[PDB]
Amino acid sequence: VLSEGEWQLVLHVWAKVEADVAGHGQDIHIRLYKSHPETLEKHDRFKHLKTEAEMKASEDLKKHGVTVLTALGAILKKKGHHEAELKPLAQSHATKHKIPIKYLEFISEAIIHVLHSRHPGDFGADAQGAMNKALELFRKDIAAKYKELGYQG
């Protein structure tokens, strides 16, 4: 559970993310793929992408990152009351894409890194702590939904 103050900090930085969902998404994916090269293997149309510039140039990847962060943003806005938003996402990621919780930590780390890089003055210790607790909550609940669907990774 987050405090109301923690949610605010979460949603305050999120509003900043929303000034350029596309760019944030690209940075988060590029960081994810470079930090944890095994994650790229989940994406068939993203393996032809060999350099940081090809990634940035890929309209497919850019669109996808907007889809990711839109879905995560909508989750965050519910301040924990996110079962309806989280279920379809558990569903595809558990039974179709097969994304281990470990990979959700990796992208969570990339999110934190990109957030700090782009918004250091709106992402100090408290705001980092809060986004961290939010992503941890997202991860705990999605893991519980993975298990409900029969998926252990």
Using CB under 6 A, pick the residue from 12, 16, 42, 118 that binds ligand HEM.
42
Longest Cα–Cα distance in the chain: 43
Q: Which residue has the tokens 């949603």?
A: 11
Q: Was 93 annotated as part of a binding site?
A: yes
Q: Which residue has the tokens 């999120």?
A: 14
Q: Does residue 99 interact with ligand HEM by CB under 6 A? A: yes
Q: Does residue 63 interact with ligand HEM by CB under 6 A? A: no
Using CB under 6 A, pick the residue from 13, 89, 94, 130 that binds ligand HEM.
89
Give the single-character DSSP code of 48: S
Residue 60's alpha-carbon distances to 22, 25, 65, 66, in angstroms, are: 11, 12, 9, 10
**Amino acid sitting at position 55:** M
Q: Does residue 67 interact with ligand HEM by CB under 6 A? A: yes
Q: Does residue 58 interact with ligand HEM by CB under 6 A? A: no
Least Å distance, CB 110 to ligand HEM, is 9
Q: In this structure, what token pair is assigned to residue 68?
A: 């990711």
Binding site for ligand HEM (CB under 6 A): 39, 42-43, 67-68, 71-72, 89, 92-93, 97, 99, 103-104, 107
